Amino acid sequence: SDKLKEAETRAEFAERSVTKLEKSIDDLEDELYAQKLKYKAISEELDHALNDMTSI
Amino acid sequence: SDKLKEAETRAEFAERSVTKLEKSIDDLEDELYAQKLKYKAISEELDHALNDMTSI
Amino acid sequence: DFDDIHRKRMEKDLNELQALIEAHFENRKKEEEELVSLKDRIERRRAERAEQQRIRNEREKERQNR
Amino acid sequence: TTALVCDNGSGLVKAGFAGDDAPRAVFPSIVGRPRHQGVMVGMGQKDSYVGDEAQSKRGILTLKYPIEHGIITNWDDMEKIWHHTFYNELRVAPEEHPTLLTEAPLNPKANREKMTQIMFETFNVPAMYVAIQAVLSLYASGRTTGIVLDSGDGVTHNVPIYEGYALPHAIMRLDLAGRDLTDYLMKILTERGYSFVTTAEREIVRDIKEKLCYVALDFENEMATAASSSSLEKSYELPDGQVITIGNERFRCPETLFQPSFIGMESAGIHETTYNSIMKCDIDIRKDLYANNVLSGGTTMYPGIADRMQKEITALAPSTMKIKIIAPPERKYSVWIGGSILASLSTFQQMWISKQEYDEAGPSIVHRKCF
Amino acid sequence: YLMKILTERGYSFVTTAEREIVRDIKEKLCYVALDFENEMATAASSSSLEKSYELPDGQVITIGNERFRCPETLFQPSFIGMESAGIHETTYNSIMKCDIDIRKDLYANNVLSGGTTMYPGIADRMQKEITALAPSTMKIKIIAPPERKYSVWIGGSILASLSTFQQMWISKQEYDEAGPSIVHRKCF
Numbered sequence: 001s002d003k004l005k006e007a008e009t010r011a012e013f014a015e016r017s018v019t020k021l022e023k024s025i026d027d028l029e030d031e032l033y034a035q036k037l038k039y040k041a042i043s044e045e046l047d048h049a050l051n052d053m054t055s056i
Numbered sequence: 057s058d059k060l061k062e063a064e065t066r067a068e069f070a071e072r073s074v075t076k077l078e079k080s081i082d083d084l085e086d087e088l089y090a091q092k093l094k095y096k097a098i099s100e101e102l103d104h105a106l107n108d109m110t111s112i
Numbered sequence: 113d114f115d116d117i118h119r120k121r122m123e124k125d126l127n128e129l130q131a132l133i134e135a136h137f138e139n140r141k142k143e144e145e146e147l148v149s150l151k152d153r154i155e156r157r158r159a160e161r162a163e164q165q166r167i168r169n170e171r172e173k174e175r176q177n178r
Numbered sequence: 179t180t181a182l183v184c185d186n187g188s189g190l191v192k193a194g195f196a197g198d199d200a201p202r203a204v205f206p207s208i209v210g211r212p213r214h215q216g217v218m219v220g221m222g223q224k225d226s227y228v229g230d231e232a233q234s235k236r237g238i239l240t241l242k243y244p245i246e247h248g249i250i251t252n253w254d255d256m257e258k259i260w261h262h263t264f265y266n267e268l269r270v271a272p273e274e275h276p277t278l279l280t281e282a283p284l285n286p287k288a289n290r291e292k293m294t295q296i297m298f299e300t301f302n303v304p305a306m307y308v309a310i311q312a313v314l315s316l317y318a319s320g321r322t323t324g325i326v327l328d329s330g331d332g333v334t335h336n337v338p339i340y341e342g343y344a345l346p347h348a349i350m351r352l353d354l355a356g357r358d359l360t361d362y363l364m365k366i367l368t369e370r371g372y373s374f375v376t377t378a379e380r381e382i383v384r385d386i387k388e389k390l391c392y393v394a395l396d397f398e399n400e401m402a403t404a405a406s407s408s409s410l411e412k413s414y415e416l417p418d419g420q421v422i423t424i425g426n427e428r429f430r431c432p433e434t435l436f437q438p439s440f441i442g443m444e445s446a447g448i449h450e451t452t453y454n455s456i457m458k459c460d461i462d463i464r465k466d467l468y469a470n471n472v473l474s475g476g477t478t479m480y481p482g483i484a485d486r487m488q489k490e491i492t493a494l495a496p497s498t499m500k501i502k503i504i505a506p507p508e509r510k511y512s513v514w515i516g517g518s519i520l521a522s523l524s525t526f527q528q529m530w531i532s533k534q535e536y537d538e539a540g541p542s543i544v545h546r547k548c549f
Numbered sequence: 550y551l552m553k554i555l556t557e558r559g560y561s562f563v564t565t566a567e568r569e570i571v572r573d574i575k576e577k578l579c580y581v582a583l584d585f586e587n588e589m590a591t592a593a594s595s596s597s598l599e600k601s602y603e604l605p606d607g608q609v610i611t612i613g614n615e616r617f618r619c620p621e622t623l624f625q626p627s628f629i630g631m632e633s634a635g636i637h638e639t640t641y642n643s644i645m646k647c648d649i650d651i652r653k654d655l656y657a658n659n660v661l662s663g664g665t666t667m668y669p670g671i672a673d674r675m676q677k678e679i680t681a682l683a684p685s686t687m688k689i690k691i692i693a694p695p696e697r698k699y700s701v702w703i704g705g706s707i708l709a710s711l712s713t714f715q716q717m718w719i720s721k722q723e724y725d726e727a728g729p730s731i732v733h734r735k736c737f
């Protein structure tokens with residue numbers, strides 16, 4: 001019984017850790033992807049600016 | 057016996073998974089920071105350009 | 113006619129340029145340096161988390177190894 | 179009170195209160211019913227998404243424009259678009275605001291009469307007035323003469339005006355516009371392997387056309403250069419990945435404007451219908467029209483068109499006249515800015531078609547003195 | 550298939566009652582490998598994978614590389630002779646049949662359900678496979694709730710508890726008027 005209680009508690013703690021880590025990963029992923037899209041957009045508008053310079 | 061075997065086994069899987077998750081988290085965060093720093097270097101390139109544009 | 117072209121053109125010919133330059137300067141100042149500093153801070157915290165994870169993993173592997 | 183300067187257009191509805199610089203709400207004019215079945219219950223699924231809402235759910239809709247070439251082909255959808263524009267994008271009830279619609283030249287009468295009948299019966303406005311889309315674009319430039327080429331998305335028309343006196347016998351209306359360029363681009367993209375068929379993917383091809391295409395200064399030299407080097411191939415990322423590379427399709431899509439034989443149309447390009455429109459005018463106002471050629475409308479926003487057109491007209495015109503092409507940076511909203519200016523005038527305040535006048539003469543009042 | 554590959558070590562289960570024992574073995578021991586060839590190489594050199602299990606009468610058995618070979622059939626249906634592609638590629642094919650503008654949302658909201666998706670380590674193998682197949686820009690996310698087994702029934706309870714749904718039932722008088730073929734009609 002003692003071993004069972006300790007094991008179950010350790011398991012539950014680790015499980016909740018797992019869930020929270022997943023949520024953190026998701027949020028950081030969303031922010032990083034938004035930054036990535038921002039970077040692609042800035043580079044593309046930069047190139048458009050370069051081509052505008054080429055025009056004039 | 058069945059219960060505690062199950063619990064310890066799934067807990068070990070949890071520990072290995074969560075450690076893999078932590079490696080994933082660190083790699084993602086560091087890559088995010090590197091990309092963000094590249095972006096800020098680009099922003100300061102643009103800010104030097106804006107200081108030139110202070111010509112207007 | 114053709115006398116409002118001055119009052120609708122010359123205005124933004126300077127005010128718009130100056131205001132957009134101001135906006136770019138303030139946005140760059142607010143954004144880039146703070147983002148790089150915050151990313152460095154988060155990196156340091158991440159390294160500390162890595163050290164804590166290594167210590168805990170090693171001590172648990174030491175005890176549990178049977 | 180303030181007047182509502184609506185501008186139906188064909189492709190983008192632009193509206194806003196009179197007296198401002200830019201339209202308050204600009205959104206595509208598409209009404210798309212859902213086409214699949216739908217299994218989630220209580221999701222709150224409507225029967226028709228209009229305006230900018232149907233450009234976000236376009237994956238499961240069948241978008242269909244209610245205005246084909248200037249004329250309106252589906253009156254129920256157009257009524258829905260107007261209702262949306264008044265109530266949700268401006269949030270002003272029409273019972274307390276005059277309206278100033280715009281209409282292309284040489285359009286069928288029944289279209290205009292039905293438009294005024296709707297505005298007076300359904301929305302019940304106090305007074306509405308219909309104006310030709312080119313005179314407004316001439317207002318916005320601050321001129322009083324000049325020949326304006328208003329190449330919209332539905333129809334391209336070329337109205338010459340001198341000293342405020344329009345020349346009704348010299349209006350050259352051509353039905354090539356942005357939509358035909360979108361279809362031709364969608365048709366020549368198939369030469370590399372990319373097939374766009376669905377009415378939703380027409381929007382993607384339109385975005386490609388807007389962001390990448392440009393008008394070549396000299397067509398043959400560009401065709402020769404794009405066939406040897408690879409400095410032109412610009413890539414573009416679809417809404418799901420799988421980037422595509424556009425080669426000499428870049429300047430071949432908008433070249434259709436100057437050679438309408440590409441899409442099988444017989445008529446001459448926009449570079450030669452302007453010269454023909456000038457030559458129909460009297461011999462003493464041709465210099466002023468040459469010097470004050472005005473561009474407007476969305477489709478004239480291609481990078482490098484104000485030079486190609488000037489080169490072509492200079493080739494056609496006599497060598498002594500000076501050819502100047504006015505291309506303001508606010509080209510897209512030029513018609514609406516002109517509409518705002520016209521609605522803000524005090525001299526114009528008595529030209530509205532008051533409701534009691536409509537009650538006495540019926541919808542045919544629009545063709546009468548109140549034009 | 551597990552009952553068929555267990556015979557390679559000497560354990561023969563034939564009776565329809567022993568299929569239940571093989572099912573219990575599959576539930577308690579099998580797991581989906583993240584990379585198949587590396588696991589096949591590791592299990593053939595070391596012995597860190599061999600997990601033992603006690604039959605309903607004693608005589609413990611030791612499962613070697615049968616652990617991750619049984620559920621691998623999902624991603625390579627050629628093992629049991631089926632022609633079709635695995636569950637990692639029929640999802641991508643099902644996405645590609647959809648319209649071009651809703652593929653990003655489907656990529657980001659891939660949902661797993663049903664009992665058989667409870668193998669330890671499947672939500673990572675499937676994500677790796679789809680990320681290999683899909684374009685590099687899209688984000689691939691696999692929703693694997695812990696209550697996977699009863700997901701269908703929980704959803705059924707939610708649907709039956711809705712007020713908007715209360716008039717969609719096939720009332721008995723309607724069946725009496727149109728016969729059993731009423732189900733294909735508007736009341737789906």
Ligand SMILES: Nc1ncnc2c1ncn2[C@@H]1O[C@H](COP(=O)(O)OP(=O)(O)O)[C@@H](O)[C@H]1O
Binds near residue numbers: 188388479
């Ligand atoms: N920046 C741009 N570059 C090239 N083409 C454009 C651009 N913006 C709009 N267009 C084209 O012009 C059309 C919009 O024209 P618009 O002036 O709104 O028509 P309308 O006269 O009906 O308002 C779009 O369909 C698009 O094809």
Ligand SMILES: [Mg+2]
Binds near residue numbers: 187188311328
């Ligand atoms: Mg227009």
